[PDB]
mmCIF file of C-alpha atoms in Angstrom:
data_model
loop_
_atom_site.group_PDB
_atom_site.id
_atom_site.type_symbol
_atom_site.label_atom_id
_atom_site.label_comp_id
_atom_site.label_asym_id
_atom_site.label_seq_id
_atom_site.Cartn_x
_atom_site.Cartn_y
_atom_site.Cartn_z
ATOM 1 C CA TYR J 1 -95.224 121.354 -149.682
ATOM 2 C CA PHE J 2 -93.343 124.628 -148.980
ATOM 3 C CA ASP J 3 -95.288 125.750 -145.893
ATOM 4 C CA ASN J 4 -92.456 126.190 -143.338
ATOM 5 C CA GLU J 5 -92.472 129.794 -142.144
ATOM 6 C CA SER J 6 -88.994 129.828 -140.596
ATOM 7 C CA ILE J 7 -87.334 128.402 -143.715
ATOM 8 C CA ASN J 8 -89.214 130.884 -145.871
ATOM 9 C CA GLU J 9 -87.969 133.793 -143.738
ATOM 10 C CA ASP J 10 -84.382 132.546 -144.217
ATOM 11 C CA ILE J 11 -84.926 132.384 -147.980
ATOM 12 C CA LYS J 12 -86.380 135.896 -147.939
ATOM 13 C CA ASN J 13 -83.289 137.289 -146.182
ATOM 14 C CA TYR J 14 -81.060 135.364 -148.597
ATOM 15 C CA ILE J 15 -82.796 136.879 -151.638
ATOM 16 C CA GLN J 16 -82.986 140.382 -150.217
ATOM 17 C CA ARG J 17 -79.303 140.605 -149.313
ATOM 18 C CA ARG J 18 -78.271 139.711 -152.879
ATOM 19 C CA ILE J 19 -80.969 141.351 -155.007
ATOM 20 C CA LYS J 20 -79.868 144.827 -153.870
ATOM 21 C CA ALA J 21 -76.681 144.484 -155.955
ATOM 22 C CA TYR J 22 -78.880 145.387 -158.938
ATOM 23 C CA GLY J 23 -80.645 148.491 -157.516
ATOM 24 C CA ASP J 24 -83.701 149.173 -155.363
ATOM 25 C CA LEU J 25 -85.742 146.257 -156.638
ATOM 26 C CA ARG J 26 -89.177 145.080 -155.692
ATOM 27 C CA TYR J 27 -89.421 141.327 -156.187
ATOM 28 C CA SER J 28 -91.566 138.277 -155.714
ATOM 29 C CA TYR J 29 -90.246 134.724 -155.587
ATOM 30 C CA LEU J 30 -93.203 132.460 -156.449
ATOM 31 C CA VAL J 31 -92.883 128.654 -156.401
ATOM 32 C CA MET J 32 -95.736 126.676 -157.908
ATOM 33 C CA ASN J 33 -96.217 122.923 -158.224
ATOM 34 C CA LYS J 34 -97.511 122.472 -161.739
ATOM 35 C CA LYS J 35 -99.602 119.420 -160.877
ATOM 36 C CA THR J 36 -101.263 121.049 -157.818
ATOM 37 C CA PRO J 37 -100.958 124.782 -158.551
ATOM 38 C CA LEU J 38 -103.631 126.261 -156.303
ATOM 39 C CA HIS J 39 -101.449 127.365 -153.344
ATOM 40 C CA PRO J 40 -98.041 128.631 -154.446
ATOM 41 C CA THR J 41 -95.347 129.834 -152.066
ATOM 42 C CA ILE J 42 -94.845 133.586 -152.309
ATOM 43 C CA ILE J 43 -91.808 135.315 -150.802
ATOM 44 C CA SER J 44 -91.817 139.010 -151.626
ATOM 45 C CA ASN J 45 -91.142 142.610 -150.630
ATOM 46 C CA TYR J 46 -94.213 143.912 -152.487
ATOM 47 C CA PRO J 47 -96.791 145.735 -150.324
ATOM 48 C CA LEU J 48 -98.481 143.364 -147.901
ATOM 49 C CA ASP J 49 -101.916 144.338 -149.210
ATOM 50 C CA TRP J 50 -100.947 143.421 -152.777
ATOM 51 C CA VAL J 51 -99.794 139.973 -151.606
ATOM 52 C CA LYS J 52 -103.001 139.402 -149.621
ATOM 53 C CA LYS J 53 -105.338 140.259 -152.512
ATOM 54 C CA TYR J 54 -103.183 138.239 -154.931
ATOM 55 C CA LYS J 55 -103.403 135.143 -152.721
ATOM 56 C CA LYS J 56 -107.060 135.535 -151.754
ATOM 57 C CA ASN J 57 -108.201 135.714 -155.388
ATOM 58 C CA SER J 58 -105.705 133.055 -156.616
ATOM 59 C CA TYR J 59 -104.555 135.600 -159.189
ATOM 60 C CA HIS J 60 -101.539 133.520 -160.251
ATOM 61 C CA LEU J 61 -104.045 131.257 -162.060
ATOM 62 C CA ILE J 62 -104.921 134.083 -164.444
ATOM 63 C CA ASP J 63 -101.696 136.135 -164.256
ATOM 64 C CA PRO J 64 -100.344 136.595 -167.829
ATOM 65 C CA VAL J 65 -96.797 136.717 -166.429
ATOM 66 C CA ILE J 66 -97.217 133.383 -164.634
ATOM 67 C CA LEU J 67 -99.048 131.832 -167.581
ATOM 68 C CA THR J 68 -96.177 132.889 -169.859
ATOM 69 C CA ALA J 69 -93.473 131.698 -167.438
ATOM 70 C CA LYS J 70 -94.946 128.204 -167.301
ATOM 71 C CA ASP J 71 -94.009 127.752 -170.985
ATOM 72 C CA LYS J 72 -90.546 129.335 -170.902
ATOM 73 C CA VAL J 73 -87.004 128.738 -169.740
ATOM 74 C CA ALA J 74 -85.431 132.147 -170.645
ATOM 75 C CA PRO J 75 -86.111 135.450 -168.836
ATOM 76 C CA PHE J 76 -88.604 137.857 -170.360
ATOM 77 C CA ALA J 77 -89.825 141.414 -169.872
ATOM 78 C CA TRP J 78 -93.474 141.991 -168.969
ATOM 79 C CA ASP J 79 -94.073 143.773 -172.285
ATOM 80 C CA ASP J 80 -92.857 140.822 -174.334
ATOM 81 C CA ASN J 81 -95.312 139.630 -176.969
ATOM 82 C CA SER J 82 -96.235 136.419 -175.149
ATOM 83 C CA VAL J 83 -97.335 138.400 -172.083
ATOM 84 C CA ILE J 84 -99.360 140.896 -174.152
ATOM 85 C CA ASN J 85 -101.429 138.176 -175.855
ATOM 86 C CA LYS J 86 -102.853 136.699 -172.628
ATOM 87 C CA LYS J 87 -103.546 140.316 -171.596
ATOM 88 C CA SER J 88 -106.642 140.288 -173.857
ATOM 89 C CA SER J 89 -106.815 142.488 -167.069
ATOM 90 C CA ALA J 90 -107.890 142.148 -163.428
ATOM 91 C CA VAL J 91 -104.386 141.079 -162.381
ATOM 92 C CA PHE J 92 -102.952 144.022 -164.323
ATOM 93 C CA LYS J 93 -105.371 146.477 -162.671
ATOM 94 C CA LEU J 94 -104.227 145.290 -159.236
ATOM 95 C CA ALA J 95 -100.609 145.619 -160.365
ATOM 96 C CA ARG J 96 -101.090 149.180 -161.669
ATOM 97 C CA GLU J 97 -102.813 150.105 -158.409
ATOM 98 C CA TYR J 98 -99.565 149.297 -156.552
ATOM 99 C CA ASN J 99 -97.165 150.828 -159.137
ATOM 100 C CA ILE J 100 -96.051 147.369 -160.346
ATOM 101 C CA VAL J 101 -95.933 147.882 -164.103
ATOM 102 C CA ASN J 102 -92.367 147.736 -165.415
ATOM 103 C CA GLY J 103 -90.682 144.446 -164.753
ATOM 104 C CA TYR J 104 -89.049 141.170 -165.706
ATOM 105 C CA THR J 105 -89.512 137.499 -164.894
ATOM 106 C CA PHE J 106 -86.793 134.848 -164.533
ATOM 107 C CA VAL J 107 -88.042 131.255 -164.585
ATOM 108 C CA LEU J 108 -86.820 127.851 -163.458
ATOM 109 C CA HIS J 109 -88.421 124.408 -163.776
ATOM 110 C CA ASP J 110 -87.108 121.604 -161.595
ATOM 111 C CA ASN J 111 -87.391 117.821 -161.572
ATOM 112 C CA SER J 112 -90.141 117.796 -158.913
ATOM 113 C CA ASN J 113 -92.803 119.466 -161.124
ATOM 114 C CA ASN J 114 -92.138 122.832 -159.502
ATOM 115 C CA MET J 115 -91.894 126.103 -161.349
ATOM 116 C CA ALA J 116 -90.004 128.896 -159.580
ATOM 117 C CA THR J 117 -90.150 132.508 -160.769
ATOM 118 C CA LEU J 118 -88.269 135.601 -159.624
ATOM 119 C CA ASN J 119 -90.343 138.596 -160.721
ATOM 120 C CA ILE J 120 -88.670 141.990 -160.359
ATOM 121 C CA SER J 121 -89.758 145.567 -160.956
ATOM 122 C CA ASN J 122 -88.396 149.033 -160.222
ATOM 123 C CA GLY J 123 -89.356 150.732 -156.985
ATOM 124 C CA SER J 124 -87.358 153.854 -156.144
ATOM 125 C CA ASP J 125 -85.613 153.967 -159.525
ATOM 126 C CA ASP J 126 -86.175 155.508 -162.921
ATOM 127 C CA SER J 127 -87.224 152.851 -165.386
ATOM 128 C CA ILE J 128 -84.379 153.480 -167.840
ATOM 129 C CA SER J 129 -81.541 152.807 -165.424
ATOM 130 C CA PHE J 130 -83.532 149.925 -163.922
ATOM 131 C CA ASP J 131 -83.925 148.293 -167.347
ATOM 132 C CA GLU J 132 -80.266 148.806 -168.234
ATOM 133 C CA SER J 133 -79.189 147.234 -164.946
ATOM 134 C CA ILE J 134 -81.361 144.153 -165.585
ATOM 135 C CA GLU J 135 -80.208 143.857 -169.211
ATOM 136 C CA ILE J 136 -76.577 143.963 -168.089
ATOM 137 C CA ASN J 137 -76.992 141.583 -165.091
ATOM 138 C CA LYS J 138 -79.479 139.112 -166.617
ATOM 139 C CA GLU J 139 -77.129 136.130 -166.240
ATOM 140 C CA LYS J 140 -76.338 136.940 -162.604
ATOM 141 C CA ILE J 141 -80.002 137.342 -161.628
ATOM 142 C CA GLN J 142 -80.866 134.004 -163.241
ATOM 143 C CA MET J 143 -78.076 132.413 -161.163
ATOM 144 C CA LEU J 144 -79.550 134.042 -158.054
ATOM 145 C CA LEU J 145 -82.874 132.362 -158.860
ATOM 146 C CA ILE J 146 -81.094 129.020 -159.344
ATOM 147 C CA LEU J 147 -79.106 129.199 -156.104
ATOM 148 C CA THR J 148 -82.145 130.381 -154.104
ATOM 149 C CA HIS J 149 -84.239 127.468 -155.352
ATOM 150 C CA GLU J 150 -81.399 125.016 -154.699
ATOM 151 C CA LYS J 151 -81.024 126.447 -151.189
ATOM 152 C CA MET J 152 -84.742 126.138 -150.454
ATOM 153 C CA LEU J 153 -84.951 122.556 -151.681
ATOM 154 C CA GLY J 154 -82.006 121.616 -149.460
ATOM 155 C CA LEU J 155 -83.547 123.183 -146.374
ATOM 156 C CA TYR J 156 -86.841 121.378 -146.913
ATOM 157 C CA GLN J 157 -85.118 118.052 -147.542
ATOM 158 C CA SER J 158 -83.121 118.640 -144.323
ATOM 159 C CA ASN J 159 -86.237 119.569 -142.333
ATOM 160 C CA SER J 160 -88.161 116.480 -143.471
ATOM 161 C CA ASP J 161 -85.189 114.242 -142.569
ATOM 162 C CA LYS J 162 -85.059 115.675 -139.035
ATOM 163 C CA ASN J 163 -88.810 114.947 -138.680
ATOM 164 C CA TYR C 1 -88.119 113.496 -180.919
ATOM 165 C CA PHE C 2 -85.591 116.190 -181.876
ATOM 166 C CA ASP C 3 -84.547 114.593 -185.183
ATOM 167 C CA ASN C 4 -84.353 117.614 -187.530
ATOM 168 C CA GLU C 5 -80.693 117.617 -188.583
ATOM 169 C CA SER C 6 -81.102 121.045 -190.184
ATOM 170 C CA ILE C 7 -82.295 122.517 -186.882
ATOM 171 C CA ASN C 8 -79.715 120.540 -184.893
ATOM 172 C CA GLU C 9 -77.041 121.833 -187.291
ATOM 173 C CA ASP C 10 -78.238 125.396 -186.644
ATOM 174 C CA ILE C 11 -78.147 124.718 -182.881
ATOM 175 C CA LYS C 12 -74.585 123.451 -183.255
ATOM 176 C CA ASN C 13 -73.539 126.623 -185.108
ATOM 177 C CA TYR C 14 -75.222 128.730 -182.449
ATOM 178 C CA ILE C 15 -73.360 126.991 -179.606
ATOM 179 C CA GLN C 16 -69.921 126.886 -181.195
ATOM 180 C CA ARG C 17 -69.813 130.599 -182.012
ATOM 181 C CA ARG C 18 -70.605 131.401 -178.402
ATOM 182 C CA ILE C 19 -68.946 128.614 -176.441
ATOM 183 C CA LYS C 20 -65.539 129.441 -177.967
ATOM 184 C CA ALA C 21 -65.560 132.687 -175.982
ATOM 185 C CA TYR C 22 -64.758 130.805 -172.745
ATOM 186 C CA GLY C 23 -61.729 128.964 -174.168
ATOM 187 C CA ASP C 24 -61.038 125.861 -176.227
ATOM 188 C CA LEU C 25 -63.886 123.769 -174.851
ATOM 189 C CA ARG C 26 -65.315 120.382 -175.704
ATOM 190 C CA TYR C 27 -69.007 119.972 -175.017
ATOM 191 C CA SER C 28 -72.136 117.945 -175.423
ATOM 192 C CA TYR C 29 -75.641 119.399 -175.336
ATOM 193 C CA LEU C 30 -77.832 116.453 -174.325
ATOM 194 C CA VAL C 31 -81.646 116.600 -174.251
ATOM 195 C CA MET C 32 -83.716 113.737 -172.871
ATOM 196 C CA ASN C 33 -87.423 113.111 -172.307
ATOM 197 C CA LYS C 34 -88.823 110.225 -170.291
ATOM 198 C CA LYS C 35 -91.326 109.499 -173.076
ATOM 199 C CA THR C 36 -88.400 108.528 -175.370
ATOM 200 C CA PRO C 37 -85.738 107.385 -172.896
ATOM 201 C CA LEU C 38 -83.647 105.403 -175.386
ATOM 202 C CA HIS C 39 -83.411 108.157 -178.027
ATOM 203 C CA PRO C 40 -81.763 111.217 -176.493
ATOM 204 C CA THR C 41 -80.497 114.025 -178.679
ATOM 205 C CA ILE C 42 -76.769 114.834 -178.617
ATOM 206 C CA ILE C 43 -75.224 117.959 -180.152
ATOM 207 C CA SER C 44 -71.510 117.828 -179.430
ATOM 208 C CA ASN C 45 -67.971 118.373 -180.666
ATOM 209 C CA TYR C 46 -66.693 115.249 -178.901
ATOM 210 C CA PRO C 47 -64.986 112.531 -180.991
ATOM 211 C CA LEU C 48 -67.684 111.293 -183.337
ATOM 212 C CA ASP C 49 -67.585 107.635 -182.314
ATOM 213 C CA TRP C 50 -67.629 108.443 -178.605
ATOM 214 C CA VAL C 51 -71.127 109.757 -179.370
ATOM 215 C CA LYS C 52 -71.824 106.577 -181.342
ATOM 216 C CA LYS C 53 -70.955 104.233 -178.462
ATOM 217 C CA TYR C 54 -72.534 106.433 -175.773
ATOM 218 C CA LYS C 55 -75.739 106.487 -177.830
ATOM 219 C CA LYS C 56 -75.430 102.789 -178.755
ATOM 220 C CA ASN C 57 -75.150 101.486 -175.177
ATOM 221 C CA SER C 58 -77.585 104.104 -173.769
ATOM 222 C CA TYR C 59 -74.964 105.233 -171.269
ATOM 223 C CA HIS C 60 -77.034 108.305 -170.313
ATOM 224 C CA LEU C 61 -79.186 105.942 -168.235
ATOM 225 C CA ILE C 62 -76.221 104.960 -166.011
ATOM 226 C CA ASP C 63 -73.923 107.985 -166.351
ATOM 227 C CA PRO C 64 -73.188 109.254 -162.786
ATOM 228 C CA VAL C 65 -73.073 112.807 -164.174
ATOM 229 C CA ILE C 66 -76.537 112.563 -165.769
ATOM 230 C CA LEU C 67 -77.997 110.747 -162.752
ATOM 231 C CA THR C 68 -76.726 113.625 -160.612
ATOM 232 C CA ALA C 69 -78.095 116.223 -163.046
ATOM 233 C CA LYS C 70 -81.626 114.878 -162.478
ATOM 234 C CA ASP C 71 -81.406 115.984 -158.840
ATOM 235 C CA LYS C 72 -79.828 119.337 -159.683
ATOM 236 C CA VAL C 73 -80.784 122.794 -160.721
ATOM 237 C CA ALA C 74 -77.307 124.451 -160.244
ATOM 238 C CA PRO C 75 -74.092 123.681 -162.201
ATOM 239 C CA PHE C 76 -71.662 121.133 -160.759
ATOM 240 C CA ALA C 77 -68.247 119.604 -161.388
ATOM 241 C CA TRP C 78 -67.839 115.969 -162.396
ATOM 242 C CA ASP C 79 -65.651 115.305 -159.355
ATOM 243 C CA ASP C 80 -68.234 116.675 -156.885
ATOM 244 C CA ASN C 81 -69.108 114.290 -154.056
ATOM 245 C CA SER C 82 -72.667 113.798 -155.305
ATOM 246 C CA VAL C 83 -71.287 112.419 -158.590
ATOM 247 C CA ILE C 84 -68.670 110.229 -156.917
ATOM 248 C CA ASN C 85 -71.359 108.822 -154.581
ATOM 249 C CA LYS C 86 -72.900 107.343 -157.754
ATOM 250 C CA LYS C 87 -69.641 106.101 -159.312
ATOM 251 C CA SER C 88 -68.336 101.104 -164.713
ATOM 252 C CA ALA C 89 -68.583 100.757 -168.498
ATOM 253 C CA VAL C 90 -69.374 104.453 -169.012
ATOM 254 C CA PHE C 91 -66.324 105.370 -166.907
ATOM 255 C CA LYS C 92 -63.996 103.207 -169.003
ATOM 256 C CA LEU C 93 -65.415 104.564 -172.269
ATOM 257 C CA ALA C 94 -64.983 108.109 -170.954
ATOM 258 C CA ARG C 95 -61.297 107.574 -170.159
ATOM 259 C CA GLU C 96 -60.556 106.344 -173.699
ATOM 260 C CA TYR C 97 -61.427 109.708 -175.273
ATOM 261 C CA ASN C 98 -59.849 111.871 -172.516
ATOM 262 C CA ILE C 99 -63.191 113.241 -171.265
ATOM 263 C CA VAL C 100 -62.105 113.494 -167.673
ATOM 264 C CA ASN C 101 -62.702 116.531 -165.471
ATOM 265 C CA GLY C 102 -65.625 118.611 -166.595
ATOM 266 C CA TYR C 103 -68.685 120.572 -165.487
ATOM 267 C CA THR C 104 -72.387 120.159 -166.124
ATOM 268 C CA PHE C 105 -75.027 122.867 -166.462
ATOM 269 C CA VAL C 106 -78.625 121.687 -166.050
ATOM 270 C CA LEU C 107 -82.044 122.798 -167.237
ATOM 271 C CA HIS C 108 -85.541 121.359 -167.004
ATOM 272 C CA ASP C 109 -88.422 122.651 -169.123
ATOM 273 C CA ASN C 110 -92.198 122.348 -169.015
ATOM 274 C CA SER C 111 -92.308 119.652 -171.707
ATOM 275 C CA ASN C 112 -90.511 117.238 -169.341
ATOM 276 C CA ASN C 113 -87.226 117.641 -171.167
ATOM 277 C CA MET C 114 -84.021 117.683 -169.237
ATOM 278 C CA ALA C 115 -81.229 119.550 -171.019
ATOM 279 C CA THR C 116 -77.596 119.455 -169.926
ATOM 280 C CA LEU C 117 -74.552 121.262 -171.267
ATOM 281 C CA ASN C 118 -71.535 119.115 -170.384
ATOM 282 C CA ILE C 119 -68.148 120.827 -170.749
ATOM 283 C CA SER C 120 -64.557 119.566 -170.536
ATOM 284 C CA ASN C 121 -61.174 121.018 -171.347
ATOM 285 C CA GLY C 122 -59.736 120.882 -174.838
ATOM 286 C CA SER C 123 -56.223 122.112 -175.577
ATOM 287 C CA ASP C 124 -55.779 124.608 -172.730
ATOM 288 C CA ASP C 125 -54.081 123.765 -169.464
ATOM 289 C CA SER C 126 -56.319 122.278 -166.793
ATOM 290 C CA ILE C 127 -55.992 125.200 -164.357
ATOM 291 C CA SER C 128 -56.897 128.045 -166.732
ATOM 292 C CA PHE C 129 -59.864 126.015 -167.979
ATOM 293 C CA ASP C 130 -61.080 125.552 -164.395
ATOM 294 C CA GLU C 131 -60.664 129.264 -163.663
ATOM 295 C CA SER C 132 -62.477 130.035 -166.908
ATOM 296 C CA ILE C 133 -65.477 127.818 -166.223
ATOM 297 C CA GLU C 134 -65.846 129.269 -162.744
ATOM 298 C CA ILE C 135 -65.587 132.966 -163.601
ATOM 299 C CA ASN C 136 -68.038 132.475 -166.506
ATOM 300 C CA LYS C 137 -70.522 129.966 -165.010
ATOM 301 C CA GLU C 138 -73.455 132.449 -165.059
ATOM 302 C CA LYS C 139 -72.812 133.242 -168.713
ATOM 303 C CA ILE C 140 -72.518 129.544 -169.592
ATOM 304 C CA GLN C 141 -75.763 128.740 -167.765
ATOM 305 C CA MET C 142 -77.408 131.504 -169.774
ATOM 306 C CA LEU C 143 -75.910 130.051 -172.950
ATOM 307 C CA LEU C 144 -77.587 126.718 -172.173
ATOM 308 C CA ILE C 145 -80.909 128.492 -171.438
ATOM 309 C CA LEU C 146 -80.832 130.454 -174.720
ATOM 310 C CA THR C 147 -79.720 127.459 -176.796
ATOM 311 C CA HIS C 148 -82.615 125.429 -175.410
ATOM 312 C CA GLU C 149 -85.086 128.286 -175.918
ATOM 313 C CA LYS C 150 -83.837 128.588 -179.508
ATOM 314 C CA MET C 151 -84.149 124.855 -180.164
ATOM 315 C CA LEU C 152 -87.709 124.678 -178.806
ATOM 316 C CA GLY C 153 -88.622 127.717 -180.894
ATOM 317 C CA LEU C 154 -87.204 126.239 -184.085
ATOM 318 C CA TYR C 155 -88.936 122.888 -183.623
ATOM 319 C CA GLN C 156 -92.133 124.805 -182.843
ATOM 320 C CA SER C 157 -91.857 126.768 -186.103
ATOM 321 C CA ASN C 158 -91.069 123.664 -188.141
ATOM 322 C CA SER C 159 -94.128 121.863 -186.755
ATOM 323 C CA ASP C 160 -96.429 124.816 -187.464
ATOM 324 C CA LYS C 161 -95.317 125.243 -191.087
ATOM 325 C CA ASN C 162 -95.943 121.516 -191.682
#
């Protein structure tokens, strides 16, 4: 579905140019078809090794953040009560190993059965100023998710039309 | 079926306190599910019998704005080319109540609902309304998101206590 490497590199540059307005953010943009969810598209500036282990073990299938996002429309912090209940592990060990612990998820569902998430966490920043920046810019970051997804859908429609 | 008038009243309160911050706006919050296509839910401050006729003739099925919203994830104006490219009874009815040049904010959820917040000018002048909707579009999208999250949560609670 979303397997085109050159489009995905354009989307990555699009996200990365705009996400830095909010600080030094680590992010992943994960797009999952909810009827065939085994192979999601992952565009991210997390460490390459994290991404490889996450894909190889299909960790999104047991990731409490992803499992919570599938039932939501509004953004949530990773300590919100819905995330903590599915926590009752392996995905969170991998995350802690790569200093990915404090974070937020913005979610979008579209009319093609896709779920798109923008998951963001602090990298070079203290967690307090990171959290305040996300709390203040929540509406703008959600719009970034919406315009990224819209952009990606248009590029794939355009690429299929050319072929 | 979102039939609880007590919840829908609370949703209406929630929207009107917050939507007034962007000006004197008219709106309809429309939620539809393909499992009940002829019974959509409308929370709105439009003229009451505009709602009645819209609901009566099931105009959401042929409304160019709603048909465009199904392909959208980002907000759009009613005079955008993608709407025009779908543009007659719903048009005529719309003109009678002065619901002319507006904007639509769109949301899909994981229960196969589509929610739209449809917004048009009230008393203000057309230009300041347009500038308002465009400087505040992120906030208004978030208002739709939080309204819908609140409605789902209230219907969830009501079902559990039953």
